[PDB]
Amino acid sequence: RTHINYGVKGDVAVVRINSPNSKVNTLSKELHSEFSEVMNEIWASDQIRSAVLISSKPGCFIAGADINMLAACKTLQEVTQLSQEAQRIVEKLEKSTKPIVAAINGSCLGGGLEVAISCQYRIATKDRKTVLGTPEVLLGALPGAGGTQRLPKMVGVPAALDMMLTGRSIRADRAKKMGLVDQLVEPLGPGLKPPEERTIEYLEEVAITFAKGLADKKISPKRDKGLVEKLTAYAMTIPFVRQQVYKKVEEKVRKQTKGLYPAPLKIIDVVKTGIEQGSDAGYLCESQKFGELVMTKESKALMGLYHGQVLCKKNKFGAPQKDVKHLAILGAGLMGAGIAQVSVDKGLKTILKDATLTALDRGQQQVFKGLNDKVKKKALTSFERDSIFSNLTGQLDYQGFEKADMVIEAVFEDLSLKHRVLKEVEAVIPDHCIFASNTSALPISEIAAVSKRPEKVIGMHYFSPVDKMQLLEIITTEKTSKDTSASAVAVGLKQGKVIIVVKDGPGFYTTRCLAPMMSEVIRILQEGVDPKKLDSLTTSFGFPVGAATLVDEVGVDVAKHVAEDLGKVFGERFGGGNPELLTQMVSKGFLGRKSGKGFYIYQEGVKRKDLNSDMDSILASLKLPPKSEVSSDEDIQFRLVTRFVNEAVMCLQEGILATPAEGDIGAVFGLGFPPCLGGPFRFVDLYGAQKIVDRLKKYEAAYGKQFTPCQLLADHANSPNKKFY
Template sequence: MKTDSFLVEVHEDNIAIITMDVPGETMNTLRSEFGDEVRQVLDFLKSRNDLKGVVFTSGKPDSFIAGADINMLASCETAEDVYKLSRDGHKLLNELASQRLPVVAAIHGPCLGGGLELALACDYRVISNSPKTVLGLPEVQLGILPGGGGTQRLPKLVGIAKSLDLMLTGKQLRPKQAVKLGVADEMVPNTVLIEVAKKHLAKGKRGKVAPKLKGAEKLLEATSAGRNIIYKQALKTVMSKTKGNYPAPEKIIDCVKASSGDLESGLKLEAKHFSELVMSSESEALRSIFFATTEMKKETGAGDVEPKPVKRTMVLGGGLMGGGIANVTAVKAKVPVRIKDIAHEGISKAMSSTWKQLDKKVKRRHILESERDKTMSLLTGTLDYQGAQSIDMVIEAVFEDLKLKHQMVKDVEANCGPDTIFATNTSSLPIGQIAAVAERPEQVIGLHYFSPVEKMPLVEVISHEKTSAQTIATTVKFAKKQGKTPIVVKDCAGFYVNRILAPYMNEAANLLLEGEAIEKLDNSLVNFGFPVGPITLLDEVGIDVGAKISPILEAELGSRFAAPAAFDKLLADGRMGRKNGKGFYRFDSDKKGAKPVDESVYKVLGITPSPRLSDSEIAERCVVQMLNEAARCLDEGIIASARDGDIGAIFGIGFPPFLGGPFRYMDKLGAKQLVAILERYQSLHGDRFEPCERLKAMAAEDLRFYE
């Protein structure tokens, strides 16, 4: 029998193979409208008394089921709509689980979210050993919880502690991990997946499952007192990381608690919590990020212009940034990269960092030695430009010195081909100034990575007024191959991310000089939702780096970017932060946990800590500076849209994801409210708080950035 998305074939051995293949999609996703189709499939199975078992698989070449269609949630208008959606799913999966026939899920490719919940409702799970196969319940990353029975079936299968770890982190399991944990029963090559799945049917219906537990974990999960210890520890860990800003983890723990009782009661609680979370502002914000990044994957940054392929690259500079750029080019993009440096030591250091990362994966059995060696073969080094004629893109990562960068432009144009793109990884110098000496300025572009390059997801693609559309499109596509989320921004001092970060950091510095304690400043912004506080960030980035950027921003954009003069005293005292082990915090401490404050820094700055403001007041003063500058950037066309501004702030500097980014947060506050806050601070602290024209106009007409 066949429906639009499901094909049921009964083989000569009287085994039914159900193949899911959603038409017109590269991946299968679960949708509410499939209910009738699934009902037809289940009725067909009931009607066949000759069947011995069922294998459920996918018709997609490299995907099982990637999860539920997120658009389905956006279409729900009330919590009752969401509750019904979850309960309808429960009903169908319960029927699948209670079939008189044994059912095996034959899984190749991503099996995530609702896809794994469907697989958990089957008796057995056989998975391919392909690196494309991953299993997980990542719903927490969207501010929700598994709503198709996952919170109830997974704990019964793998135990409480392991299921909490999977659901609270959203981590994805590789095939070996899935089998070891007990989520999957067997791992085989994809070529024999269906045959092996059929063999599992001979075992018949699966009886009661028992988690593979050992030692202390087994003892803890055997009693209610032990289980309570697990729940309390899980909640404590969650709260230390989320500061209570994300409601989903707590509700996941509550649902897992219910899994020790009867299934139906647990499913009802799951549906209740699921419906509440879907309607929450946090989930709405997190889902908006998902939709934004999905849209951006399809964009070139330059309309319909066709990007050119980048087959060979060169990185100028083997330092921290250059080594990181070379790493993502070889490891993620799988493109050959030649590292050019003035010394063998720089090249060796850059290659060594990639080797260490890959070798660690080998030792953890995530990749084979042959894969490591193949990736390393893409990295080569040179002290000159020999053979550079074939290079498609040069990425420059040398010191922030305009004369040096001018020399790099001239060298590349003299030694590389006429079509070579020159991408500069500058964090503050305007690209137009760097391109001023170029014979082919249309091929000069900014490509601003964030440190550490291997981990930070954002890259800013900066076009100056002469950059060609094809250069933009080619650079955007290449950045995506490197595993980055690129936003195209207009050329201006600080571009977008550093420009909105600078006034936020300066305000934290002003608060410090007013007597607020270092750890209180940092804790206030971490509690607000940032991954680290501004003072910690300054230590990590480098106090000397901040000192170099501030004058450039002030010269180009005005006095509101002036850094407190007292900070010159830090450099005079030799304080550069982590890089030289001397900054606001102590780096010589062996104590675990948070680093202690270096109390001597107060004396250097000539201040005595005398905290007087609340956490919320401190956070507000810093954050509104960032919001005001973000609105200015949109008004000036530095970013193309509020969406790009939100993604840039979240992925570039860790703006709290549960707020959806600065522009969604401004919509939540309301332009009138934000302008009133800024004007109040302007009257207290001066014109650096003056609201920009865009915000004042929006306040007057009660407008929003998103409609």
């Protein structure tokens, strides 16, 4: 038994989950076996009246194995099959003649939760790493081991749905009061053995005392829900009330999903069709509709985005020589404070610098508020916050720069400026100090020109808002050093970002691929189509943001700044609409933030329910007419997508994108590429490496523009080829 161990004490068995690698205990087929065996022993053995099961591996409790999900994936019901065989095991546990206490140490997600959810008594540690959740959804699937049946029964219909729809992890304490966990235990300080280890021991020791007691049938001291929970829970007994809940939820999912994702909808069913019909009807609906999903195109796509994310959270270049211990951000703007906060709270002693004291405050405020909000959300102590905020030493002049290990520029998009700063800074920072530039348009070469040491100059293109976003596009020039990169990557990862590395370009992978769309957008808006229709046309195609309201938000002017700066560097294929109407906005006085159809009520930038009253007048002035085979609503969509997908695959071709996975991760996490599609490189593999070109040639010759497939795109088309696999 390389996974599940054994051992006994008194009339209480003590199972011990620990995978061979030990890194994280996942539910393997062979593990399932060992376990299924160990139970039968303690089950039948008259020597044992009760039992416990805890994780020896410190990292976590259980995670659920993706090992054999798409691997042993043969038929639609070779998966469905699996689900059942799992349901069967846990049902044995649930309906056990001997009490079984689940001692949950660390991570307990998906499968793992669906087990402790079957056991008699759940006991979990009050740790941050101790999370419970059903992220099955996130991979386009759903809980395939009773989760759809036991959670509703255990934690009410609402929370049980939320938990299985959002896939949100639940904090230990939250999980306790929520009714998911029966009992809680705080982790221990140092002792004879290290904390983790001694803690685990304690947890076991406790789980046992409970186990023993449960066997003796001594558990009549339950808790009280109160008056609110007693009512709401009762109200949930009434069938026509539950209907109104399944409806209000389905509606909310439907509309926030745009309806492109299947799992979230099929989960609402399996829960209903199990608590409205028999559990037997449920479990076997879950089982079937599980595999039914695993085969869905979306799920396939999201599993790919999941995996890419695993890699993109690991250091491509391994550890650097010097671990950045002293950081310095340049520009207490938005993306400065944003960046600062993401660094300070991690423990990195950072230095925020700006010109005027006024602008040094705004930044200092954000990074404060940011922490302070994290306190209210119950994620940070008031003390932790205040303390963390001390690590943030803000200033106007470079005082401590003498000791900077890394430096990050976050000033305007002006190369003249970017140079002035690089010069100044490089004149006061040590030799080993890296310099990174948070830019989108300007290349890291034309900036690293003035560099006294361009080996130490590397691009770090963060994404806004840096407070919440997690994509980080690390640019690399040829002169750029390997270790200089291996540090920049290690910093972004500490900042807790998902990292994609690209070779320097004129408009790097992200901004570049974005451009052609923003042109085609202008063109469409100038073709008679309007915001509402375009926003709706893209959002409903899977886009997180409406193509037009994307712009009206991003920068009506910062549109031109890059549309033309990057249109001059290419202009060939990027030639879409007339950037005059784009100018006619700025010069005639139009902006995202006020005037342009994406405004908000009173001095609080409040509500929406409004567009623009005039951009109609100026739009009407200069606007071409539609086409025949390209004016279609479905065409208007692929017009955009294809152009993007092309420049994307082209960036792989040109060697800018190291991998297709990265290409995808960045595209979805950063550009807002519809994830159901799975990324532009997945979208090729699934939608059709050919069908995508035929669709592209139809928006090329038919639209008299050189918006034509590149080599590597058309390369995959002329054969049965796929990038990812």
